[PDB]
Design a binder for this molecule. Sequence first.
Ligand SMILES: Cc1cc(C)c(C)c(S(=O)(=O)N(CC(=O)O)c2cccc(-n3ncc(C(=O)O)c3C3CC3)c2)c1C
Length: 289
Amino acid sequence: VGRLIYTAGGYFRQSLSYLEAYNPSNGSWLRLADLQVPRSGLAGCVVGGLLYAVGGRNNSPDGNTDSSALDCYNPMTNQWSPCASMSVPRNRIGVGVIDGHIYAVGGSHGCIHHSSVERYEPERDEWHLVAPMLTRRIGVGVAVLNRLLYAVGGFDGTNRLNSAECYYPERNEWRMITPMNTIRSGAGVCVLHNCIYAAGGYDGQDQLNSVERYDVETETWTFVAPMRHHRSALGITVHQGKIYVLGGYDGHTFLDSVECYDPDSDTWSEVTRMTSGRSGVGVAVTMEP
Ligand SMILES: Cc1cc(C)c(C)c(S(=O)(=O)N(CC(=O)O)c2cccc(-n3ncc(C(=O)O)c3C3CC3)c2)c1C
């Protein structure tokens, strides 16, 4: 009990510093301490009850600064603190956590499309590079299942991708997995039960409402019910056995919609709206502040 869905950063006209937290048990939103630097295209994660904001970019009227930053929010103090920075700026990043360590995957720095990957150790406050992906990927979706890390879709500098790959930590090695049925860049990627879900994204022509899941045992991708709204650059997380998708861009509007997927019924419902429409947020779940 007592866990909230935290959304950090995002973009609407410029990158945003908002940190807001949604309580599924009562429908309420809380506005919390702003990020120290506005950022969109970041990712969020939680280790040890602390919320981390990783990478992104400050897209402002005065220009664009890609972020190498790692910042930590403590709900017990409602305070952000800087951590050690990554080796390189990473906008449009994906992150996953394996056994208490944060993996920062891919992303962009200006016209550079990264294949590099690095791993953060919170107890030592240090980053170190690990093996790079087989493919350069920006707008990559990342999730962890059974202590294996998956990098899904994205854009390699020339094409949006249906490909995906898995990192095997004990071998420090990446291997391709079955490609998705749909090209997806800027999708929401998460884990639920024994599958990696990829929701939404941009296929090179339209923002998508389709959702597909990779069963790590059978190596197949299967479509599930589509979202009500097409969305790219959506936030995503899992909480109490359901997927939540937050915001994004539908080709017309920066959405405030939050939808929730129930795997038992294979249906999506609208559960709340964010306080303002935005895309490119980081999202994670931890205890209330
Ligand atoms: C529409 C729009 C306009 C602006 C100015 C911004 C900042 C944004 S954003 O904040 O959410 N965003 C950060 C950024 O683009 O710098 C951002 C965040 C995550 C992923 C991506 N991503 N990666 C590759 C591709 C691709 O098209 O293949 C995309 C697009 C989402 C499909 C982008 C948005 C949407």
